[PDB]
Design a protein around this motif. Structure first.
Motif, PDB file in Angstrom:
ATOM      1  N   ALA A  43       0.847  -1.194   0.000  1.00 43.47           N
ATOM      2  CA  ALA A  43       0.000   0.000   0.000  1.00 43.47           C
ATOM      3  C   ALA A  43       0.883   1.243   0.000  1.00 43.47           C
ATOM      4  O   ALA A  43       1.982   1.225   0.560  1.00 43.47           O
ATOM      5  N   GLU A  44       0.404   2.310  -0.639  1.00 46.14           N
ATOM      6  CA  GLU A  44       1.146   3.567  -0.717  1.00 46.14           C
ATOM      7  C   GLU A  44       1.106   4.318   0.620  1.00 46.14           C
ATOM      8  O   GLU A  44       2.139   4.489   1.277  1.00 46.14           O
ATOM      9  N   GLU A  45      -0.088   4.763   1.011  1.00 39.65           N
ATOM     10  CA  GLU A  45      -0.308   5.404   2.315  1.00 39.65           C
ATOM     11  C   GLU A  45       0.546   6.650   2.565  1.00 39.65           C
ATOM     12  O   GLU A  45       1.116   7.226   1.639  1.00 39.65           O
ATOM     13  N   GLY A  46       0.618   7.061   3.828  1.00 37.14           N
ATOM     14  CA  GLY A  46       1.419   8.208   4.226  1.00 37.14           C
ATOM     15  C   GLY A  46       0.625   9.474   4.514  1.00 37.14           C
ATOM     16  O   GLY A  46      -0.573   9.421   4.798  1.00 37.14           O
ATOM     17  N   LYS A  47       1.313  10.613   4.444  1.00 39.29           N
ATOM     18  CA  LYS A  47       0.709  11.935   4.640  1.00 39.29           C
ATOM     19  C   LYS A  47      -0.246  12.014   5.828  1.00 39.29           C
ATOM     20  O   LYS A  47      -1.466  11.923   5.668  1.00 39.29           O
ATOM     21  N   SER A  48       0.328  12.197   7.016  1.00 39.48           N
ATOM     22  CA  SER A  48      -0.446  12.353   8.245  1.00 39.48           C
ATOM     23  C   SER A  48      -1.072  13.739   8.311  1.00 39.48           C
ATOM     24  O   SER A  48      -0.553  14.687   7.724  1.00 39.48           O
ATOM     25  N   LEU A  49      -2.191  13.849   9.022  1.00 39.90           N
ATOM     26  CA  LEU A  49      -2.864  15.133   9.190  1.00 39.90           C
ATOM     27  C   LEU A  49      -1.890  16.175   9.726  1.00 39.90           C
ATOM     28  O   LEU A  49      -1.974  17.353   9.384  1.00 39.90           O
ATOM     29  N   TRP A  50      -0.964  15.729  10.565  1.00 33.54           N
ATOM     30  CA  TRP A  50       0.013  16.624  11.160  1.00 33.54           C
ATOM     31  C   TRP A  50       1.050  17.092  10.142  1.00 33.54           C
ATOM     32  O   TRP A  50       1.486  18.242  10.187  1.00 33.54           O
ATOM     33  N   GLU A  51       1.444  16.216   9.221  1.00 32.34           N
ATOM     34  CA  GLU A  51       2.469  16.588   8.248  1.00 32.34           C
ATOM     35  C   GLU A  51       1.918  17.428   7.097  1.00 32.34           C
ATOM     36  O   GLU A  51       2.677  18.043   6.348  1.00 32.34           O
ATOM     37  N   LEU A  52       0.595  17.446   6.960  1.00 30.08           N
ATOM     38  CA  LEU A  52      -0.066  18.345   6.018  1.00 30.08           C
ATOM     39  C   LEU A  52       0.048  19.770   6.551  1.00 30.08           C
ATOM     40  O   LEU A  52       0.236  20.728   5.798  1.00 30.08           O
ATOM     41  N   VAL A  53      -0.068  19.883   7.868  1.00 32.60           N
ATOM     42  CA  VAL A  53       0.120  21.142   8.568  1.00 32.60           C
ATOM     43  C   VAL A  53       1.547  21.645   8.376  1.00 32.60           C
ATOM     44  O   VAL A  53       1.761  22.752   7.890  1.00 32.60           O
ATOM     45  N   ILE A  54       2.519  20.816   8.746  1.00 33.57           N
ATOM     46  CA  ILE A  54       3.929  21.179   8.646  1.00 33.57           C
ATOM     47  C   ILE A  54       4.283  21.728   7.267  1.00 33.57           C
ATOM     48  O   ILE A  54       5.013  22.717   7.151  1.00 33.57           O
ATOM     49  N   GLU A  55       3.761  21.087   6.226  1.00 35.05           N
ATOM     50  CA  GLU A  55       4.093  21.469   4.855  1.00 35.05           C
ATOM     51  C   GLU A  55       3.473  22.804   4.459  1.00 35.05           C
ATOM     52  O   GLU A  55       3.974  23.488   3.568  1.00 35.05           O
ATOM     53  N   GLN A  56       2.388  23.176   5.126  1.00 38.21           N
ATOM     54  CA  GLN A  56       1.782  24.473   4.885  1.00 38.21           C
ATOM     55  C   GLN A  56       2.725  25.591   5.314  1.00 38.21           C
ATOM     56  O   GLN A  56       2.646  26.705   4.801  1.00 38.21           O
ATOM     57  N   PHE A  57       3.623  25.289   6.246  1.00 37.10           N
ATOM     58  CA  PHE A  57       4.503  26.313   6.802  1.00 37.10           C
ATOM     59  C   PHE A  57       5.958  26.144   6.395  1.00 37.10           C
ATOM     60  O   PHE A  57       6.861  26.451   7.168  1.00 37.10           O
ATOM     61  N   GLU A  58       6.184  25.664   5.180  1.00 40.85           N
ATOM     62  CA  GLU A  58       7.540  25.531   4.671  1.00 40.85           C
ATOM     63  C   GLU A  58       7.779  26.513   3.538  1.00 40.85           C
ATOM     64  O   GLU A  58       8.923  26.786   3.170  1.00 40.85           O
ATOM     65  N   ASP A  59       6.689  27.045   2.994  1.00 40.50           N
ATOM     66  CA  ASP A  59       6.767  28.087   1.979  1.00 40.50           C
ATOM     67  C   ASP A  59       7.571  29.280   2.499  1.00 40.50           C
ATOM     68  O   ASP A  59       7.378  29.730   3.627  1.00 40.50           O
ATOM     69  N   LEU A  60       8.472  29.783   1.663  1.00 43.49           N
ATOM     70  CA  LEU A  60       9.402  30.837   2.054  1.00 43.49           C
ATOM     71  C   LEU A  60       8.701  32.090   2.574  1.00 43.49           C
ATOM     72  O   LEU A  60       9.001  32.571   3.672  1.00 43.49           O
ATOM     73  N   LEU A  61       7.766  32.614   1.784  1.00 36.78           N
ATOM     74  CA  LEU A  61       7.018  33.808   2.170  1.00 36.78           C
ATOM     75  C   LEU A  61       6.203  33.585   3.440  1.00 36.78           C
ATOM     76  O   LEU A  61       6.032  34.503   4.232  1.00 36.78           O
ATOM     77  N   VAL A  62       5.698  32.369   3.629  1.00 39.76           N
ATOM     78  CA  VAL A  62       4.949  32.044   4.835  1.00 39.76           C
ATOM     79  C   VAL A  62       5.859  32.118   6.059  1.00 39.76           C
ATOM     80  O   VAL A  62       5.459  32.631   7.110  1.00 39.76           O
ATOM     81  N   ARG A  63       7.086  31.619   5.907  1.00 37.48           N
ATOM     82  CA  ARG A  63       8.109  31.727   6.942  1.00 37.48           C
ATOM     83  C   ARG A  63       8.392  33.193   7.251  1.00 37.48           C
ATOM     84  O   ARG A  63       8.373  33.621   8.420  1.00 37.48           O
ATOM     85  N   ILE A  64       8.679  33.956   6.197  1.00 38.36           N
ATOM     86  CA  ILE A  64       9.003  35.366   6.354  1.00 38.36           C
ATOM     87  C   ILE A  64       7.855  36.098   7.032  1.00 38.36           C
ATOM     88  O   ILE A  64       8.082  36.919   7.917  1.00 38.36           O
ATOM     89  N   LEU A  65       6.625  35.782   6.629  1.00 34.18           N
ATOM     90  CA  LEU A  65       5.452  36.410   7.224  1.00 34.18           C
ATOM     91  C   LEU A  65       5.225  35.921   8.658  1.00 34.18           C
ATOM     92  O   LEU A  65       4.719  36.664   9.506  1.00 34.18           O
ATOM     93  N   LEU A  66       5.614  34.678   8.930  1.00 29.56           N
ATOM     94  CA  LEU A  66       5.531  34.125  10.279  1.00 29.56           C
ATOM     95  C   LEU A  66       6.567  34.786  11.192  1.00 29.56           C
ATOM     96  O   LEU A  66       6.278  35.120  12.340  1.00 29.56           O
TER      97      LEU A  66
END
Ligand SMILES: C/C=C(/C)C(=O)O[C@H]1C(C)=C2[C@H]([C@@H]1OC(=O)CCCCCCC)[C@@](C)(OC(C)=O)C[C@H](OC(=O)CCC)[C@@]1(O)[C@H]2OC(=O)[C@@]1(C)O
Ligand code: ALF
Ligand SMILES: [K+]
Ligand SMILES: [Mg+2]
Length: 994
Positions: A43-66
């Protein structure tokens, strides 16, 4: 065990050291299970609800704005006992946005079906083995099957592993390999070696592939491979390894964000060097930590002003509304971003069967004999319309409708097609369509009989359920099928023995009705039927008949042809042995030739027109099919991929022919050829990959499991509404109506949407340019901040956000589907437009920082006029003897900022109008061209007033409403931006590039 198809059965048994009537020992099985693993796909699987969150905050501008959010929080947190309730609005508003975007983002990828899980439905729970500890067959978990197992399969089974056939127990073994080939037609297997080391699946007629299914018969085989090491496992691994790239727009937005961070950085450095003066000589009022607060507040403003914080919401709303429109036109879009990409598609790869064609085998030509003149033979040919299993269509003579019952030969032809037949037709009430029951090539005959209606049965008032077999049933009332002589490979025909019904007057004596491959059937005919009479089959008559059939089977027709015949005086029942198929040929001799039918899987009606439209939009269409090359090319001609008489020597290839090209020339073949045939699933993704290596935006359309890898690899995969769940879950879009036209409409919508997207992107990002100039200008001079983050956030999110969305609804250009696709490398802003936006950027900054200066000085109220002191207001504290006639605080007045915000707002509203067209004056293309744009500007302006006139809004935004005089100034400063941009558009239109 590799190369199973080219080994003999003896070599396969000797390889595993097993006997076919014993099978592996249970200890061998345990050993194989350890060595080869279980027979299953991971089975492929993966991508936890928590890691969907983490990835939302890896964008450069999102970091800068954070980062600015926390810097803002730390500042707001440690503040004086002045106002510590409205201080935190800045941090929270920034944090609110980031959190808002994130939760939305995670909802977009949460609901994503797994294509690999859908694939796992071709994996039977159970299989059947012979192992050494029992004589009888053992029903076990298919996952416990191993290489070396002796396995049994029978009608209706899903094949559990990749298997070398050892022994066929039934007369034939008929296999539906559509998961590998897209073709549901029965493959007739055998047990001899297939010597070609490069045989494709279509050539491996002595193999059974895991996940295919047995349409008829029973066989024994030995397992060659299990698990991922099977054909279906290769499909699974190709999907696992694919892998959606950022869209062209995403890449430009990413590059923008990268370049934005450099710009922000360089500017921060600058503000530092500009203040290296107040460094060694800062009065010491002073200095201390006051510098940290000051400098950092400038960093926060620079960050906020540089970043279009409203853009993500604008883009999502645009794409979501686009998706709803597409759904109205029957394109169901699963991937929001794919709404754009579809528009710059330069090549559409397409599966054939069920995609370009109906996948409904149809008899479209037939003939009988009209007269024989010793040596001359006159054929009577008809054509039949209709392209589905629905009994809808008519029989034509010279293109005009005739009643088939007029012709005795056709009555007999229909009788044979009805009785010599193991299939039927079914009306599926849930789907609203007719479906086959049994083999496509036999159901074609059923459908033909319903169209012919040779007894003129009244059918107009049957329900669709009853209509399905009505005419065939009438024929079953005249002749009783006693028994069938099933098809065998040696003779390539089948027949049925019938007797006239009790009380029938229409006939006497028993009959065998025969159908099969033309050569062998005709060789066995001694007579030919002419109406109701029969005459001897002569050499010259046989030659004429075979030649015409041969033409039907090749060239532009390339139909599958069956010869139909009757044994007029069959052997007596008791003289026939029904348990030995080897006798059937002899029973089917001394036949009387009746006629021939020719069938194909035909093009969908709308396809030819759609391809032409794609061609008008600069879009190539390429057929990539598991079907044979002769059929592939003929269909290409019928749908206009090739001309009727075009020479396709290097424009059409089997997968193998393609593979034989040197690697350099395979790439070029993909740019030149429009037809690839007899391919394997991995050929399709390979072709898509080559196309993409030219940096072409490639779509793939299909309906089969074997399309899935290509559907995954293409930028846009497009699945048929009635196709497999595997192809659908592999796709970005589904054609709910199976209409190829919908692809064209989707491309147009994508083009229209993208044209509007870049205006609102242009609009928003250019404002940020002006905002940054403001923050920088109001720092390099030492002026009291003309704008602050909270005000910048409102504009970028709401004030400008509403008009940005309105622009998303600019009327589309009318020539949109007459242009070639945009280059996916096309910059959103370059050249003249760029410097043009620099000029508005400069205008915006000066105008804003200016309106505030005007208030500090020339404005009646009006601290006022200071000059040198305004640029030294941080010294009203200590060095006060100079700052006389004014309160040490009037430099934090709301009026100056409100003038600055109102200028910014009014300019951004005018710039929203300027953004309706890139190069057309408002004189040639006026505001009211987009009614919702005016509506949005009125709304943004009424929101601006809201914040100026409704407590405690003005306190939290640090604004104070203006009077008519101050507004009169807001307008003089602002409105000229329309004049400025009209002149810049004017030159671009004429001198520059016009
Ligand atoms: C938005 C606010 C400004 C401050 C900014 O950082 O954007 C720059 C930068 C990141 C580019 C520039 C901006 O560069 C500037 O004009 C500098 C102005 C401010 C510097 C000092 C003033 C005090 C864009 C905005 O400016 C124009 C409009 O003149 C155009 C374009 O942007 C696009 O094409 C948008 C892509 C989605 C990009 O050059 C872009 O970077 C490149 O990668 C592209 C291809 O992105
Ligand atoms: F339906 Al195909 F290649 F799978 F034509
Ligand atoms: K894809
Ligand atoms: Mg198909």
């Amino acid at each position: 065990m590799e190369a199973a198809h080219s080994k003999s059965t003896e070599e396969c048994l000797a390889y595993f050291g097993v006997s076919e009537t014993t099978g592996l020992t249970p200890d061998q099985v345990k050993r194989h299970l350890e060595k080869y693993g279980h027979n299953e796909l991971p089975a492929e699987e993966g991508k936890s609800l928590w890691e969907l969150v983490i990835e939302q905050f890896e964008d450069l501008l999102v970091r800068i704005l954070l980062l600015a959010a926390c810097i803002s929080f730390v500042l707001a947190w440690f503040e004086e006992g002045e106002e510590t309730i409205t201080a935190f609005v800045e941090p929270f508003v920034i944090l609110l946005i980031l959190i808002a975007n994130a939760i939305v983002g995670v909802w977009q990828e949460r609901n994503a079906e797994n294509a690999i899980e859908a694939l796992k439905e071709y994996e039977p729970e159970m299989g059947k083995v012979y192992r050494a500890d029992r004589k009888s067959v053992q029903r076990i978990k298919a996952r416990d099957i191993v290489p070396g197992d002796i396995v049994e399969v029978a009608v209706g089974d899903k094949v559990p592993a990749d298997i070398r056939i050892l022994s066929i127990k039934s007369t034939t073994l008929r296999v539906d390999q559509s998961i590998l080939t897209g073709e549901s037609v029965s493959v007739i297997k055998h047990t001899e070696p297939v010597p070609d080391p490069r045989a494709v699946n279509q050539d491996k007629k002595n193999m059974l592939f895991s996940g295919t299914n047995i349409a008829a018969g029973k066989a024994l085989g030995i397992v060659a491979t299990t698990g991922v090491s099977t054909e279906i496992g290769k499909i699974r691994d190709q999907m696992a390894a694919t892998e959606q790239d950022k869209t062209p727009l995403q890449q430009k937005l990413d590059e923008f964000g990268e370049q934005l961070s450099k710009v922000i950085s360089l500017i921060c450095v600058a503000v530092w060097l500009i203040n290296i003066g107040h460094f060694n000589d800062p009065v010491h009022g002073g200095s201390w930590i006051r510098g940290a607060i000051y400098y950092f507040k400038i960093a926060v403003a620079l960050a906020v002003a540089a970043i279009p914080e409203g853009l993500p919401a604008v883009i999502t709303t645009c794409l979501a509304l686009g998706t709803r429109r597409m759904a109205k036109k029957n394109a169901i879009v699963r991937s929001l971003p794919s709404v754009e990409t579809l528009g710059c598609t330069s090549v559409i790869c397409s599966d054939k069967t069920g995609t370009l064609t109906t996948n409904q085998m149809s008899v479209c030509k037939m003939f009988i004999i009209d007269k024989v003149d010793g040596d001359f033979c006159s054929l009577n040919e008809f054509s039949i319309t209709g392209s589905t299993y629905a009994p809808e269509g008519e029989v034509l003579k010279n293109d005009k409708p005739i009643r088939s019952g007029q012709f005795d030969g056709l009555v007999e032809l229909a009788t044979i097609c009805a009785l010599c037949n193991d299939s039927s037709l079914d009306f599926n009430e849930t789907k609203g369509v007719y479906e086959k029951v049994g083999e496509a090539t036999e159901t074609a005959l059923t459908t033909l009989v319903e169209k012919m209606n040779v007894f003129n049965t009244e059918v107009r008032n049957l329900s669709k359920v009853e209509r399905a077999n009505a005419c065939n049933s009438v024929i079953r009332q005249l002749m009783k099928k006693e028994f069938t002589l099933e098809f065998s490979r040696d003779r390539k025909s089948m027949s049925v023995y019938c007797s006239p019904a009790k009380s029938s007057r229409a006939a006497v004596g028993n009959k065998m009705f025969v159908k099969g491959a033309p050569e062998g059937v005709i060789d066995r005919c001694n007579y030919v039927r002419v109406g109701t009479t029969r005459v001897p089959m002569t050499g010259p008559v046989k030659e004429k008949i075979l030649s015409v059939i041969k033409e039907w089977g090749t060239g532009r027709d390339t139909l599958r042809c069956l010869a139909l015949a009757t044994r007029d005086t069959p052997p007596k029942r008791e003289e026939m042995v029904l348990d030995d198929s080897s006798r059937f040929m002899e029973y089917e001799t001394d036949l009387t030739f009746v006629g021939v039918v020719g069938m194909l899987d035909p093009p969908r009606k709308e396809v030819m027109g759609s391809i032409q439209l794609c061609r008008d939009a600069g879009i190539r269409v390429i057929m990539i099919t598991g079907d044979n090359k002769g059929t592939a090319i003929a269909i290409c001609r019928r749908i206009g991929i090739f001309g009727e008489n075009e020479e396709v020597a290097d424009r059409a290839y089997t997968g193998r022919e393609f593979d034989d090209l040197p690697l350099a020339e395979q790439r070029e073949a993909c740019r030149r050829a429009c037809c690839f045939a007899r391919v394997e699933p991995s050929h399709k993704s390979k072709i898509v990959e080559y196309l993409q290596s030219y940096d072409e935006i490639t779509a793939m359309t299909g309906d089969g499991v074997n399309d899935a890898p290509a559907l995954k690899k293409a930028e846009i995969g497009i699945a048929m509404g009635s196709g497999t769940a595997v192809a659908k879950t592999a796709s970005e879009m589904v054609l709910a109506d199976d209409n190829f036209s919908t692809i064209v409409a989707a491309v147009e919508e994508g083009r229209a949407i993208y044209n509007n997207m870049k205006q609102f992107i242009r609009y928003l990002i250019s404002s940020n340019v002006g905002e940054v100039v403001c923050i920088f200008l109001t720092a390099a001079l030492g002026l009291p901040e003309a704008l602050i983050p909270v005000q910048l956030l409102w504009v970028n999110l709401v004030t400008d956000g509403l008009p940005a969305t309105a622009l998303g609804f600019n009327p589309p250009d009318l020539d949109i589907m007459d242009r070639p696709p945009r280059s996916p490398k096309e910059p959103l802003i370059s050249g003249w437009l760029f410097f043009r936006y620099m000029a508005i950027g400069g205008y915006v900054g000066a105008a804003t920082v200016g309106a505030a200066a005007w208030w500090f000085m020339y404005a009646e109220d009006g601290p006022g006029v200071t000059y040198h002191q305004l640029t030294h207001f941080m010294q009203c504290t200590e060095d006060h003897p100079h700052f006389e006639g004014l309160d040490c605080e009037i430099f934090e007045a709301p009026e100056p900022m409100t003038m600055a915000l109102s200028v910014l707002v009014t300019i951004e509203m005018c710039n929203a109008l300027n953004s309706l067209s890139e190069n057309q004056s408002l004189m040639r293309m006026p505001p009211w061209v987009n009614i919702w744009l005016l509506g949005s500007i009125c709304l943004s302006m009424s929101l601006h007033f809201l914040i100026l006139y409704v407590d405690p809004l003005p306190m939290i935004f640090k604004l104070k409403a203006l009077d008519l005089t101050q507004w009169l100034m807001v307008l003089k400063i602002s409105l000229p931006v329309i004049g400025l941009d009209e002149i810049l558009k004017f030159i671009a239109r004429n001198y520059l590039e016009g």
